[PDB]
Design a protein around this ligand. Sequence first.
Ligand SMILES: Nc1ncnc2c1ncn2[C@@H]1O[C@H](COP(=O)(O)OP(=O)(O)OP(=O)(O)O)[C@@H](O)[C@H]1O
Ligand SMILES: Nc1ncnc2c1ncn2[C@@H]1O[C@H](COP(=O)(O)OP(=O)(O)OP(=O)(O)O)[C@@H](O)[C@H]1O
Ligand SMILES: NS(=O)(=O)c1cc(C(=O)O)c(NCc2ccco2)cc1Cl
Ligand SMILES: NS(=O)(=O)c1cc(C(=O)O)c(NCc2ccco2)cc1Cl
Ligand SMILES: [Cl-]
Ligand SMILES: [Cl-]
Ligand SMILES: [K+]
Ligand SMILES: [K+]
Ligand SMILES: [Mg+2]
Ligand SMILES: [Mg+2]
Ligand code: NA
Ligand code: NA
Lengths: 909, 909
Amino acid sequence: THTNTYYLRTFGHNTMDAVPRIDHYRHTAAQLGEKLLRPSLAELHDELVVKFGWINGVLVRCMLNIWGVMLFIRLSWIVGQAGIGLSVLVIMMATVVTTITGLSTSAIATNGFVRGGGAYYLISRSLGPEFGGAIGLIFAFANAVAVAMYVVGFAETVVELLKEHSILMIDEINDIRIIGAITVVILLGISVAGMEWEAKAQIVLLVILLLAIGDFVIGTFIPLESKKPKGFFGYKSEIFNENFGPDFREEETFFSVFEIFFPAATGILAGANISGDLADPQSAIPKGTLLAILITTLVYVGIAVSVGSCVVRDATGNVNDTIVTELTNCTSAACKLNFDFSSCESSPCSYGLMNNFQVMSMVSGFTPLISAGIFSATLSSALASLVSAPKIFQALCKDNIYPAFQMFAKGYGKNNEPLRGYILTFLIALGFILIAELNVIAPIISNFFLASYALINFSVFHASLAKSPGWRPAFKYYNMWISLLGAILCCIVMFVINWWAALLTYVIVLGLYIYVTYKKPDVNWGSSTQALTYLNALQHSIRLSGVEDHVKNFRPQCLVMTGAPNSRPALLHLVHDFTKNVGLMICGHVHMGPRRQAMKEMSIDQAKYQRWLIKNKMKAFYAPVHADDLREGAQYLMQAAGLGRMKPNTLVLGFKKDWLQADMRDVDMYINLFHDAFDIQYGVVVIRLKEGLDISHLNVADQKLLEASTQFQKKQGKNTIDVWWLFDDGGLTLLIPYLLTTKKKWKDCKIRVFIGGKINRIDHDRRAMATLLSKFRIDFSDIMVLGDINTKPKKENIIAFEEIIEPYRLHEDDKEQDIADKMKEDEPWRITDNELELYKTKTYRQIRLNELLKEHSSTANIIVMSLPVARKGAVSSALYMAWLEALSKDLPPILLVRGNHQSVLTFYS
Amino acid sequence: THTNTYYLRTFGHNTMDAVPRIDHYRHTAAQLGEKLLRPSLAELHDELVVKFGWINGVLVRCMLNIWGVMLFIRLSWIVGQAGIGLSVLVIMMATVVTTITGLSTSAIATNGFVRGGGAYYLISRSLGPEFGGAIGLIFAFANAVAVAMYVVGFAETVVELLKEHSILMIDEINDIRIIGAITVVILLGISVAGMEWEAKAQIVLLVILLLAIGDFVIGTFIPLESKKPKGFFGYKSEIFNENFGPDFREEETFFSVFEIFFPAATGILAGANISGDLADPQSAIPKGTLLAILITTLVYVGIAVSVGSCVVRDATGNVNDTIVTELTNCTSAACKLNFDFSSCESSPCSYGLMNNFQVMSMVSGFTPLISAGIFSATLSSALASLVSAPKIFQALCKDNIYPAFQMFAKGYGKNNEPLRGYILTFLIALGFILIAELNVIAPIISNFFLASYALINFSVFHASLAKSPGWRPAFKYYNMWISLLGAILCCIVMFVINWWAALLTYVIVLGLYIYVTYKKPDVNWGSSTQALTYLNALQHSIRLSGVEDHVKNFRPQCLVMTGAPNSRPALLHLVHDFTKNVGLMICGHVHMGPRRQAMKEMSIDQAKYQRWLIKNKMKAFYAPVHADDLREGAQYLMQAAGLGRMKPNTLVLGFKKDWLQADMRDVDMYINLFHDAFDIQYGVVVIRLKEGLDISHLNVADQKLLEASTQFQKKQGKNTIDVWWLFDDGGLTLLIPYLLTTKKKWKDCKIRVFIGGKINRIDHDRRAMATLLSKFRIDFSDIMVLGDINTKPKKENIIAFEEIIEPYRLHEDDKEQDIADKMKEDEPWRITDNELELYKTKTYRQIRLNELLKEHSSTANIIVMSLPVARKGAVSSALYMAWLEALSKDLPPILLVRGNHQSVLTFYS
Ligand SMILES: Nc1ncnc2c1ncn2[C@@H]1O[C@H](COP(=O)(O)OP(=O)(O)OP(=O)(O)O)[C@@H](O)[C@H]1O
Ligand SMILES: Nc1ncnc2c1ncn2[C@@H]1O[C@H](COP(=O)(O)OP(=O)(O)OP(=O)(O)O)[C@@H](O)[C@H]1O
Ligand SMILES: NS(=O)(=O)c1cc(C(=O)O)c(NCc2ccco2)cc1Cl
Ligand SMILES: NS(=O)(=O)c1cc(C(=O)O)c(NCc2ccco2)cc1Cl
Ligand SMILES: [Cl-]
Ligand SMILES: [Cl-]
Ligand SMILES: [K+]
Ligand SMILES: [K+]
Ligand SMILES: [Mg+2]
Ligand SMILES: [Mg+2]
Ligand code: NA
Ligand code: NA
């Protein structure tokens, strides 16, 4: 029926359904998605500029940042004060911390597409805005200060080089400050020039540093007799054996050495912070960072061991001190080789592995080459930090976490460059350089770095804890327990060095976290915090599902038929008063009208009203439902609403005030709602107000209605709480008012109970009731026993009730049997004469109860009375409505309660 | 119509409804007559021996138990080693701990009738069986050991009194052993004699103790020169000032003094342990315990101050006197009055406050009275402990918490008295007396008492934390924070003295708690633990209700329509595999039949199936519903099931295997269930098995069906998962198999992806799909692109489909245009020729897809394929069912998935 070419066309061209394509999931505004538009379910169902590679962008950056001052200056001192083994152990511990941090970072960076800000973006998108902003501020400031520290190191090295000659301008501190200012200006200029220039400069510095390392390694293998007077002796096993072990020749300990060394391993995130300029993160960051860490650790360990195997701790440089005669009785490591480096214990000798900070330069075949290597290392580290800080700050400011800093987010040029961030970082670094004494500052910045690492590790662990299906990290060489251990180790290490610095950093982090949480920025990124919230709720619900029910653990789980949650405020607040912190509260709303529009109406209403309830401080659940009429929607809610053991057991309704001026079908639906509630074993609570409950539409009447709506919101003075417990429903009638009095807004109100008694047994019945409610431990102010019930109500009230009921009567007696049956068939709510004759006693009881309530409980703050139960099929809906209206007419706020008839009170324990 | 009578009769005689009466809430066997019967809601709605008072039962017992050895023996030593102020401080600290414990006990004992036992009953009924059993065992053993210690103290005092004369039988330790054995036998006899006899003995002992205290107080006010050589001097401000302030003569310390004194504060629970024999608790325990504590503390403090204000720390027995008309050169308090009790700073003088342990006897005006008082105090404390232990043990054994001890709950006599418990306590006490050296044992028992007190305080705090409406304590003189502070103080105090004893007691408590929780005795007391479980679930749900939705936080919340949870095991386990630990799972069951019987059936099913699910380790929720047909119940569940944000979003049901051999109305209801799910914005998952899903009714066919049911309960093995993602439904089709692979039972299985492409573009489409799913980070083992779709399926398959569809065609073309319309109206599921002509392409697509699946995925462990969506009103129900049947048949387990069409996957972070 068609050509063979047609049968081989593109799959999906003959159907509205779309094949899965990348454009369906991309949100980027690329050509507005001309063809990347997957059809919605309704449509198918409804009736008819510069990017860097991983090598240059991550590996080189991380290596340059990690290698700093200690590479050529303080490594020898560390290997001296602590033996080869102890120094290697310190290096390995720092490397372990950094490696755990790198694994966590690689895991976090392989989940989605990272945009900008290495540590900040990852931490924020994986944990939440609070932690994200706190760590962003901390890390940015730490990098800004590290820029100054590196510049100061370079300046001090150059000043020492000048002091090696006659060149000098001012005192040492002032010369250091001048050199630091000049160097920081040069670095700022280079950084502002552009990112490609920075990359080229970094490559040059890296090659210079590698040349310096190679020069040192070559020099250590070419001993010269001239260096023999100094500590250098070549590779001798005697020196290696002697240099082992912790000869702490000063007021310093192992922990102090570790603290001194640690800043040497705090450049691992240089590549990550360039995520905004990486060609392809999720493939460059992990491998580059891990390789850089491995290379730097290997170089550190090798250099430490080599320096410790070819230099003596103490060596008194003196040409006329070698030879050591011919035969010696000296057991010293130097003595075994030559007399050089002898008699140093008493007289403090010039240098050696313990007192000289230029041993690496001396060992190297070429000294100026090592000097250039030191310069390049320090400058490279400073440049990396100075580039990293503005990127993190701009990423943090783009999110508007701190509105005051929104200025430092604008970009310049083809590639968005935070020039303002660069200027701010330059200012901070220049200030800290002008201080020129960063010895005290260093522990604080080290602790800042450790806090950032620990929060990265904790973010990985937290994400692995909340088993969100979106976690799905691409990197598969991590572990939740390893990451948790890494976070704990980071905290412990930060506390080990400068405990008070650790306390200060923790205080700062906590303060920033609290500020951000209070601010609550308007943004959600799908952090693991929300996933953990859902998982915790689910686990707690599952746990509660296995708990057996007990009478003393009973709580009122009320399904309030409120319509729009804001439509009826009085009912909502009243139900909230005895439900908050005790029992569940579901606000049920039934939507009518066309299903097509009702679906969108309910979809909007869900979010709108849940947000309204949350913002209004009411701990309720919105439960929208779409149904033809109110009765069937209530049926839906009473059958399915809730989850597990947290389902409703009480139905709360507002009184149908306008039942007289309304279609009898609506009244029938109301009474049938009552009947269904009773049928499914539900407690029923009806709240009646003189003015009504609905204020959505909203003269004198409107003002009174609004006042009634707002009445149950302030402190309820102390007037009374009248409970007319006439029938034993199981105790709910008494449990409601007690829970009311248990709240602050109702504490001043006293509960006085009304019961029906015998005329000649008033005292006995009163005592029995008092004892019964004392066993229940329900405080009461007074007990009134009424013997006037069952009396005939006044003639006027009966006449009024009859006049009210006349319109809805059937008058079967005065009509033909067939006509009466036909009338009752299509109007089932009609009141039959037989039922009126049968229940004249109940009608008189309702009227007399209204009389008694008016006479006695006419000044109560709120009234709780037993709700009459009409046998289904025996009493008409109109008769039930008339009973309810007569019972509670012309009264202050009243509640009609009819419990499950299962006991909800107990005097046993 | 009625006389004056019948108008003033008892309220409630003319109605089935009952007035509230205590008989309605009493559950005791007696008083269950017709009068004390509350009518059920259905019945109203359906269509037509010795008891002690608080004084002698609690106050006297508590006072006698609290007062023990230290009252007349070591109080002087305590006031000596420490100062008056420090001794008062230790007394006040112990009293504070005991007073907080007493407040907590009175709070816990005023929350209903306490049946029997002592602290065990209160702790169990307020906290749970685990804590109850642990504390019961600990407390009973502690009381038995305390009996042993009191007997040992009495024996030691009597042995010392004998040594004061020329009376002795064997070595001191052996004589102590004989005296202790005799005393314990006498105490056991007295206790077994009854309880009234014990009360009379206790009253006699209390009178003797009061006489002894009065004798001491009288003696301290009548100084005699004979006792002047001893430390006694009468009241003198010089001695008071001298004795004020610590003087730790020996290797003692404040903490050691506190540890020595603390056992003096125990015994506050003697009255509460006789709760089963009190006239009424909730009125005797609180007041009696508090008054006893107050009186004992006042007496302790007064005696301490009096002894420290009228006796010198060091004194000499040399009657020769001192300061015989000499000059006053010494500032010692003794010199102020006379030289007596001086000059023993180097040599150890005879006795005094520091050295003598009978100063109270000497100070008193009649030593034999003080000796009798010591005897009475020790004997009364021992008797109280020996009575308390068996009561607690019997209460613990009556609950069957430890089945091995069920034999000790038996009672004897008119009043249930545990004789076996008495014998066991006597045996334990006799053994510990035979040890005769309880110095090392005292700290352990002290820590046991402290643990009991701390857990009482923690029970009060926990009850106040779980805001159960049944808490309602009658004693309104406590505080949750005060009780928590008391528990913490008890723990800290127990750890302060004998830290290793505290660790041992904590280990024992933890072990007993773990054993009880593992055993999980079948008991339900309505503890604070269950209330806290409910409250925690509610709070977590409320918190989750305020969390905004995100694509990466999406979870599959599946409303699996399974009927009876055990009826279809394969479907339940399959849904559990990709829902456990990730997303919600509600098992929906629809009940049909008469409403009256259906309600009871659903009520039974709720408990039965929730228990079955919990016992079978399935984290699902049972959701019963009563409706006329399956569609109505599914509508109920899809509209109302769930709570807050934890509500279903995916519909899972089994394939209607027997649709061909079934009424077309049922098939129409099935297809309309599909349509309703799509309309309500639900994802739909259909699971089809060759043999079916139902195994409730269950030859070869039955065996195969059972094997299919059990197939998915084991480890899958090195099979493959075939995903035919043909249409972009949002990613659910791919999300489900990934979640399957996330679990251990599906680790081996690898995901194979099938997509539709164009011939001559296979490589490009395969690369694009691989890239797209690599950005999603879902691992795959291979990607197959099929270009042979849209081709005409074999003639035989089309003929078979036509033959299958024949009995449901409308055949409108060969009709009169009126009979056809009538048939369509009567049976809307009829397949019209117009729709068949329109969707021949879709039919051929289904047939060819089945061909491709059989040819390619015939060996997959499980198949996931996109579920075709039929436009509502355009495709008949019969045609939709035929499409589904043709698409899947003669295939391994297959899942048809049609997501919400909202994206559930993302490559952004
Ligand atoms: N969607 C709904 N529409 C109307 N009433 C609802 C709805 N959902 C629950 N209800 C409950 O059913 C009752 C019906 O009252 P109705 O509006 O028929 O009489 P009314 O005198 O207008 O009441 P109100 O003063 O509350 O408007 C309300 O009090 C309300 O609590
Ligand atoms: N109360 C229920 N009664 C019947 N089916 C239900 C019910 N609740 C949910 N369902 C789902 O609807 C499907 C209807 O199956 P049906 O009663 O037609 O028997 P079937 O086609 O032989 O399949 P099965 O082997 O599951 O019985 C079931 O697979 C089941 O998953
Ligand atoms: N102690 S040091 O001179 O060898 C040293 C060495 C280095 C270094 O990077 O090797 C270093 N980096 C900057 C830094 C400080 C805190 C965190 O990072 C700082 C210092 Cl003080
Ligand atoms: N230290 S004491 O001799 O004055 C003493 C005194 C008492 C006493 O009850 O006064 C006491 N009661 C029994 C007990 C031990 C642990 C807990 O309770 C035990 C002792 Cl050892
Ligand atoms: Cl870093
Ligand atoms: Cl006690
Ligand atoms: K570094
Ligand atoms: K005691
Ligand atoms: Mg209205
Ligand atoms: Mg079936
Ligand atoms: Na560097
Ligand atoms: Na005693």
